[PDB]
Amino acid sequence: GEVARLAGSLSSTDAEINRVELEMGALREEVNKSLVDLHDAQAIAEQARQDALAAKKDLDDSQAQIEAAQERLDEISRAAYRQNGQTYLRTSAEKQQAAVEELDRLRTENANKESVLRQARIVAEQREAEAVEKQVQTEAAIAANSEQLNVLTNNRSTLVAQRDGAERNLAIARAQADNLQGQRAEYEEFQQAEQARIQAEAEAQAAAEEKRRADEAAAQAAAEAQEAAQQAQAAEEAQAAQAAETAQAAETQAAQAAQAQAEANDRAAAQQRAAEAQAAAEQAQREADAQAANDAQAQALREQALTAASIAAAALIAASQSSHATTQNPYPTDEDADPTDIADIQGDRSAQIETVIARAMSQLGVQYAWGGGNANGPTLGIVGFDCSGLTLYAFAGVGISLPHYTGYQYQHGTKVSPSEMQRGDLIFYGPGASQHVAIYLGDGQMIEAPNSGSVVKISPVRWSGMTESVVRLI
């Protein structure tokens, strides 16, 4: 059975599909960026313009402000002349000087504002030009990226062509494997993979226990090494302390020297014992990580064999039932032979549910094909899956054989009230499950193959048209 060659080439052309999809993404977003840049340069330009306008507004206010004060000086002189035909003469002379010096003020303020307008106008000139440039820039960047994208999508359509053909061949392979080797053939292969699953699972369980205990051993040897090294450290202390004190002081002389010898002896003794315990901790750590490496390696083989077992379970079921896609009788016509004959399909738990669900999610994106799907995967319509076809596919992974009809799937398992549904349950719609089926995924979302034109997708649970009960198979 050369499934695995096409399965591999399929999956590698799907790897190429996603290369090109991210590449297209990079270009598409490139345009999005310089679109952002353009709209912000435009906002900069319009803001520099409203700054220039603000400048002319106060410059004109300064104009007519100065002219209002000039005309008050004017009416002051007019009053003076008419009043030329004593305390008040003094204070009105002082008022006129106040007005003249105020006008001096407003004068130099207006010159400053004239320079402010010169610069606000130049700033708007500049950043308007900046926006003209960046505008044409991104129109041209769009031209380039639209053309390059059109290239990418030509490549993408040929890749998906290849992909549809390869999937179509994989369906051929699954059929030849299970439709060909009759029941007892897949039965033997299945019993083999189920046995290898239980054994490699037990083996991995043993490598995990020993890795845990070797890790405990690494810990004990490491701590003992550290203790012995600390006693070596205290020897260093007490030796330099003895050294300093004898440096700072006949028979008394021999007593000092003997204590120095005893100090050095204790030091090298605790030091050698520290070196020994630390090389021992190093061995214990090399063993603890050789054993952690084997625990990981054996756990990989454990779930590898667990998976190969689940698919061989799906294959037994597939070889157990007729093609639920054609009509031509796949049985003999003259009473002159004797075939295999297919089973009859018409009217812990947590780990089990997750295996089924992985199978349905693995088909996310597969196109709809009326009547498509079996225990081995998608099939040609009357390639893809239809709603009740997908559920049939998923539960065969845990050896649950379902009919390729919603109304009949509703008769299997246990009828739970819709309000207590949980992950793994079958949600049905239509009277007596005559219209549609989906798998509850938990957390108020479900996976389904819904209607013509929709790929296998995850959608929120729908309450309109729901049957009165859900069905729980595991």
Residue numbers in the entry: 41 to 125, 146 to 309, 315 to 412, 460 to 494, 509 to 600
What does the paper say about this structure?
In the order Corynebacteriales, which includes the important pathogens Mycobacterium tuberculosis and Corynebacterium diphtheriae, the most important murein hydrolase for cell separation is the endopeptidase RipA. We present here the crystal structure of a full-length RipA homologue from Corynebacterium glutamicum, Cg1735, which reveals an unusual mode of autoinhibition. We describe how this autoinhibition is relieved by the conserved transmembrane protein Cg1604 and propose an FtsEX-independent model for septal control of PG hydrolysis via the Cg1604–Cg1735 complex. In this model, two septal TM proteins, Cg1603, with a cytoplasmic N-terminal globular core, and Cg1604, with a C-terminal globular core exposed to the cell envelope, form a signaling complex that couples intracellular cell division events with PG hydrolysis during the last stages of cell separation.
The full periplasmic region of Cg1735 (residues 20 to 600) was crystallized in two different crystal forms with a high (80 to 85%) solvent content. The trigonal form was solved by single-wavelength anomalous diffraction (SAD) techniques at 3.5 Å resolution and the orthorhombic form by molecular replacement at 4.5 Å resolution. Both structures reveal a tight complex between the C-terminal NlpC/P60 CD (residues 460 to 600) and an anti-parallel two-helical coiled-coil domain (CC1, residues 46 to 238) corresponding to the highly conserved N-terminal region in the RipA family. In the orthorhombic crystal form, the long interconnecting linker (residues 239 to 372) is present but disordered in the crystal. Instead, crystal contacts in the trigonal form promote a disorder-to-order transition in this region that extends the short HL helix into a full anti-parallel two-helical coiled-coil domain, CC2 (residues 243 to 386). The presence of this new structural element precludes complex formation between the CD and the CC1 domain to occur within the same monomer. Instead, the CD–CC1 complex now forms between two different monomers in the asymmetric unit. Analytical ultracentrifugation experiments at different protein concentrations showed that full-length RipA behaves as a monomer in solution, with no trace of dimer formation even at 5 mg/mL, the highest tested concentration, demonstrating that dimerization is due to crystallization-induced domain-swapping effects. The CC2 domain is deeply engaged in—and stabilized by—crystal packing contacts in the trigonal space group. The structure of trigonal Cg1735 soaked in Cl4K2Pt was determined by SAD phasing: two major and several minor Pt sites in the asymmetric unit were found with SHELXD, and the experimental phases obtained with PHASER were significantly improved by density modification with PARROT from the CCP4 suite, as the crystal has a high (85%) solvent content.
